[PDB]
């Protein structure tokens, strides 16, 4: 009937976890082993940020450089004649 206490302070501050599934294992052990041996080295954040930046740099480089003529419009260039200057300029 009382909603305060100094001992159980977490009961009187709303620190409960409203949705907690304490299940320790949900997937196939073989599949988990085959997933952690491949996505395990990606844990090192210090060696992942400097990997992502270089990957993205080289990716937008190769794709930015080795593009296609039909795909891009700024790469296909002008294929017509230029209009003239309103005051007889070029």
């Amino acid at each position: 009937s009382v909603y305060f206490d100094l001992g159980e302070i977490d009961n009187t501050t709303g620190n409960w976890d409203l949705y907690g599934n304490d299940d320790p294992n949900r997937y196939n052990g073989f599949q988990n082993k085959f997933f952690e041996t491949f996505a395990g080295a990606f844990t090192k954040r210090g060696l992942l940020l400097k990997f992502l930046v270089l990957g993205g740099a080289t990716t937008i480089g190769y794709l930015g450089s080795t593009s296609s003529p039909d795909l891009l419009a700024i790469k296909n260039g002008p294929k017509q004649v230029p209009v003239m200057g309103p005051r007889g300029r070029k």
Partner: protein, 34 residues
């Protein structure tokens, strides 16, 4: 334009990658208590 392959190399490396890395560096420097 002599090269004409450099504008395809630099503006992707200066309007996309440069902000992407400097914003991350500055966010790490801002949100740290030392």
């Amino acid at each position: 334009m002599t090269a004409s392959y450099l504008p395809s190399i630099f503006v992707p490396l200066i309007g996309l990658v440069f902000p992407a890395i400097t914003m991350a560096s500055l966010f790490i420097y801002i949100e740290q208590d030392e």
